[PDB]
Structure 1
Amino acid sequence: RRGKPRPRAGMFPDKYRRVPMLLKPQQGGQQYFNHFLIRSTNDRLT
């Protein structure tokens, strides 16, 4: 700050510290999981 050098980025608390771990990153696309499971299973038999 004042007539002194800025702290390195790692010297501040985490920027996203208040966002829950399930949000970073979002795991979306759950709808498809089951689909591909069946698919792969099917392919194995092929």
Structure 2
Amino acid sequence: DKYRRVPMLLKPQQGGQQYFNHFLIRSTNDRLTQQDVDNA
């Protein structure tokens, strides 16, 4: 129907906010691992 009374934060329902910092630290770890691979 018309969901105009529903907020914009509820319509996609973007959950999973806990994993983002873990993903960023894993990305930094993989960048340093790639730097270790390129040097040797």
Report the TM-score when normalising by structure 2: 0.71
Residue correspondences, number: 33
Aligned match of 2:23 = 36
Structure 2 alignment gaps of length 5 or more: 34-40
Question: Over aligned residue pairs, what C-alpha RMSD do you find?
Answer: 1.2
Question: How does 1:14-33 map onto structure 2 within 5 Å?
Answer: 15-33=2-20
Report the TM-score when normalising by structure 1: 0.64
Q: More helix by proportion, 1 or 2?
A: 2
Structure 1 alignment gaps of length 5 or more: 1-13
